[PDB]
Amino acid sequence: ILINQTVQNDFITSLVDRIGLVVIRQVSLNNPLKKFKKGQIPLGRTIEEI
Amino acid sequence: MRITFNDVKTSLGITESYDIVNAIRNSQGDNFKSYVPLATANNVAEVGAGILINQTVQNDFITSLVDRIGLVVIRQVSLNNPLKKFKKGQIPLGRTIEEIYTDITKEKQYDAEEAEQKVFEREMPNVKTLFHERNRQGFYHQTIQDDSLKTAFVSWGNFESFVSSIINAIYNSAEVDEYEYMKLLVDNYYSKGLFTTVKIDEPTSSTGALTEFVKKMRATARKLTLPQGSRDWNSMAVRTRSYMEDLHLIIDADLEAELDVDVLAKAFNMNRTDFLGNVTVIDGFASTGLEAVLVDKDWFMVYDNLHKMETVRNPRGLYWNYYYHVWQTLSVSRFANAVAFVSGDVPAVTQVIVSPNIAAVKQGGQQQFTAYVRATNAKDHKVVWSVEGGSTGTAITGDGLLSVSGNEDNQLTVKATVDIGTEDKPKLVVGEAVVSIRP
Amino acid sequence: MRITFNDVKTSLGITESYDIVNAIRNSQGDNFKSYVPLATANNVAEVGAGILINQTVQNDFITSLVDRIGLVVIRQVSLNNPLKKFKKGQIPLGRTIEEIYTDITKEKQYDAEEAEQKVFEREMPNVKTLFHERNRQGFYHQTIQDDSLKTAFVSWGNFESFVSSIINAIYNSAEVDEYEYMKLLVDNYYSKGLFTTVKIDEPTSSTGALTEFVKKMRATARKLTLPQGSRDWNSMAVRTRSYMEDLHLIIDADLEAELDVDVLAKAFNMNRTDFLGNVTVIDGFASTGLEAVLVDKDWFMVYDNLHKMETVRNPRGLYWNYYYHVWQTLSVSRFANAVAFVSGDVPAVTQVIVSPNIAAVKQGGQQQFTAYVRATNAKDHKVVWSVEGGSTGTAITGDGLLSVSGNEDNQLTVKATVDIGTEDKPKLVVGEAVVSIRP
Incomplete structure (x- = not known):
């Protein structure tokens, strides 16, 4: 991994980006205040209540 | 942070003239009677021109929801450079262009008595040089907030089209700037008085003026293409000849629209009245009286030195920066014919040219100079x-012969001056050369 | 980069001594009569040293043309450090290095009657510990404007060669800095007074003094390479041994030239009157009295922890930044022999070493300390x-046996001092050792 800067940067970038995103997304959805937490915003919500 | 607009009326960009909405409501026998049977004409008149800001419109079925967008259209345009056909090539390495022209000599009277002593005499050829340099370096900068724009577009294709439109806008900017620079070349050339001036009347003032301008252009083209050549059409006063297929005439749209409806439709044999050389149309020139320009294909000397694009990313701001670098050299060749048809008041003398631009003489030698005066009228001057060397002993005679004193060390300037003004306010046109002194 | 330099003479930094031109011209039976028959001895005299700034020069025949550059040459250089062979291995991760040495023990007498109650009695070994830490962190920074550098070159090969030279400059600078850092160690060691000093008269005063220095060096090397060892040439005062093949003597070029001109080119059997160990020649030491340094191969304890290069690109400015980061540990080992061979004024005693420097004892107990004085003469001091620990009840006998009382708990410092000055002029050399106590 540490043989050269190009490989070092590629490894560190891929690791932090992908692993951090996946882990934080899967662990922030199990918090105690998760029942108010919905997923992504639905398409065409029309921001109107009927 | 939230870009919002409130209290917006659909009249900020509209300047009403007669309020057709009210006009069509009360008409008896007028031309607007055709619009009275329309049921929902009020809405069509209200939003016929479009809405600049999308107000929150409540739905018909339920008034507690939001409306979607039916369709998104991306408008794409491409702008080109009509003068791009005059471009020369590319210079990857180097900065300077050198152009060399050798001129004609003079015939000598045959003589055998004098041939016994001057057999090893020297007769230097007449040559001239011109130099051009890289003089344009610029770049175009554009930022794209892709992460801030993905959330605002329902479809991926719309976002892709938007990015493509931004890139196309960059390229259009580059093309427009190149066209403007190429026009600025001609404007500067006229500003410095290096064109060969030809006085005309205003072509659109009358059909007689139009046909006189046509006759003048045809005569000028024939004179330019005369086989024996001439030195009255190039800024270096060198004997040169031009070909009819290399002559380009640049005009505006008004003249082209006037000619075909005034003379070409009325008269038979359109080839005996239309223009001779290649004709291109632009949106006029920046000069005051300039009306037409007739130049040779080799007049333009524009080359490309660099053309590239680079991109960078900002992780903290989530955007991309695009830099488009263009490096060019823009110049013109004084050895090529270049006449300008101008209407109005022009000075009697535009420039004076000395044939040896630079000379190198010793402390006993003499130098001969030749003067060419560009005069619009036939008056002699x-x-x-x-x-202006500053020393003594060195002087020039009235016929253009400079003699250098035995002892003198400084750079000399030889000037030829023409007076065209009147008393109490003289007007002078001067052409000068540079002389260096050998030990 | 803007070419504006007018009226610059070719005499910028030149201060002539006797004006060769006048010397040649006003020669009447002088030594300069050889150059009298030279046709052009003034242009050669005034141009033969080179010019720092050039200017465009016109051609002799046609002044319109300009003389051009015919050849361009790029110089290359590669610098190394002759001390690189002393470098140890590499430590990628880590900051410190630990060194452990075990010393010899003492012999007892065989007594069976007393052996029946001291079976489990223990006698701790003699161990000494040394520490080193990384102490150099630096980098070299360069920039290259490849796009803006293309106007100064005509050949891609020359452009690439120039860029390669720019890159190699960083490595040359790194090598020079490494050499300086490595050579600073001997000066620091001498300044700390840790070398073993041998007094010599002068390597340049006389051949007798030079041969006396040679004799002293040979005797010192023979004493160093003895099978039984000696605790007289290392700052830690441990019984150590060295091998002849690992002994390096560092001298200077002046001494080397004087030696091989005086004592080697005039002596039969030159192998009996020269240096013994490996010989290294440097550009002199910075210390006042240092002449030649005799060290063991294990004396140098230099390691390299980081050697990397990182490049970044500026899209707006179109240039590359290169950073070369170097991290190193520089230190020397006190467990190896090191002789200084000083020739100036040397004090009678250079240092005092207390063999146990750090020791932990109980509340009540006795510890024995031994002291070694490094005297440069045969006199006994x-x-x-x-x-001085600030506690009452602890006392040290004149033989170096310290008995500590259990009443107090604080650190103790033990000093062994000598007086090398005269009466009313006390000059003190102090060797310090610290003692810890456990409660």
Whole structure:
């Protein structure tokens, strides 16, 4: 991994980006205040209540 | 942070004239009677021109929801450079262009008595040089907030089209700037008085003026293409000849629209009245009286030195920066014919040219100079010669012969001056050369 | 980069001594008569040293043309450090290095009657510990404007060669800095007074003094390479041994030239009157009295922890930044022999070493300390022992046996001092050792 800067940067970038995103997304959805937490915003919500 | 607009009326960009909405409501026998049977004409008149800001419109079925967008259209345009056909090539390495032209000599009277002593005499050829340099370096900068724009577009294709439109806008900007620079070349050339001036009347003032301009252009083209050549059409006063297929005439749209509806439709044999050389149309020139330009294909000397694009990313701001670098050299060749048809008041003398631009003489030698005065009228003018070296002994005669004193060390300037003004306010046109002194 | 330099003479930084031109011209039976028959001895005289700034020069025949550059040459250089062979291995991760040495023990007498109650009695070994830490962190920074550098070159090969030279400059600078850092160690060691000093008269005063220095060096090397060892040439005062093949003597070029001109080119059997160990020649030491340094191969304890290069690109400015980061540990080992061979004024005693420097004892107990004085003469210097820990009940006998009382708990410092000055002029050399106590 540490043989050269190009490989070092590629490894560190891929690791932090992908692993951090996946882990934080899967662990922030199990918090105690998760029942108010919905997923992504639905398409065409029309921001109107009927 | 939230870009919002409130209290917006659909009249900020509209300047009403007669309020057709109210006009069509009360009409009896007028031309608007055709619009009275329309049921929902009020809405069509209200939003016929479009809405600049999308107000929150409540739905018909339920008034507690939001409306979607039916369709998104991306408008794409491409702008080109109509003068791009005049471009020369590319210079990857180097900065300077050198152009060399050799001129004609003079015939000598045959003589055998004098041939016994001057057999090893020297007769230097007449050559001239011109130099051009890289003089344009620029770049175009554009930022794209892709992460801030993905959330605002329902479809991926719309976002892709938007990015493509931004890139196309960059390229259009580059093309427009190149066209403007190429026009600025001609404007500067006229500003410095290096064109060969030809006085005309205003072509659109009358059909007689239009046909006179046509006759003048045809005569000028024939004179330019005469086989024996001439030195009255190039800024270096060198004997040169031009070909009819290399002559380009640049005009505006008004003249082209006037000619075909005034003379070409009325008269038979359109080839005996239309223009001769290649004709291209632009949106006029920036000069005051300039009306037409007739130049040779080799007049333009524009080359490309660099053309590239680079991109960078900002992780903290989530955007991309695009830099488009263009490096060019823009110049013109004084050895090519270049005449300008101008209407109005022009000075009697535009420039004076000295044939040896630079000379190198010793402390006993002499140098001969030749003066060419560019005069619009046929009036004859007399030149006066002078030397501004600053030393004594060195002087120039009235016929253009400079003699250098035995002891003298400084750089000399030889000037030829023409007086065209009147008393109490003289007007002088001066052409000068540079002389260096050998030990 | 803007070419504006007018009226610059070719005499910028030149201060002539006797004006060769006048010397040649006003020669009447002088030594300069050889150059009298030279046709052009003034242009050669005034141009033969080179010019820092050039200017455009016109052609002799046609002044319109300009003389051009015919050849361009790029110089290359590669610098190394002759001390690189002393470098140890590499430590990628880590900051410190630990060194451990075990010393010899003492012999007892065989007594069976007393052996029946001291079976489990213990006698701790003699161990000494040394520490080193990384102490150099630096980098070299360069920039290259490849796009803006293309106007100064005509050949891609020359452009690439110039860029390669720019890159190699960083490595040359790194090598020079490494050499300086490595050579600073001997000066620091001498300034700390840790070398073993041998007094010599002068390597340049006379051939007798030079051969006396040679004799002293040979005797010192023979004493160093003895099978039984000696605790007289290392700052830690441990019984150590060295091998002849690992002994390096560092001298200077002046001494080397004087030696091989005086004592080697005039002596039969030159192998009996020259240096013994490996010989290294440097550009002199910075210390005042240092002449030649005799060290062991294990004396150098230099390691490299980081050697990397990182490049970044500026899209707006179109240039590359290169950073070369170097991290290193520089230190020397006190467990190896090191002789200084000083020739100036040397004090009688250079240092005092207390063999146990750090020791932990109980509340009540006795510890024995031994002191070694590094005297540069044959005289004997007495040693005075003292302890200053600020506690009552602890005392040190004149033989160096310290008995500590259990009433107090604090750190103790033990001093062994000698007086090398005269009466009313006390000059003190102090060797310090610290003692910890456990409660």
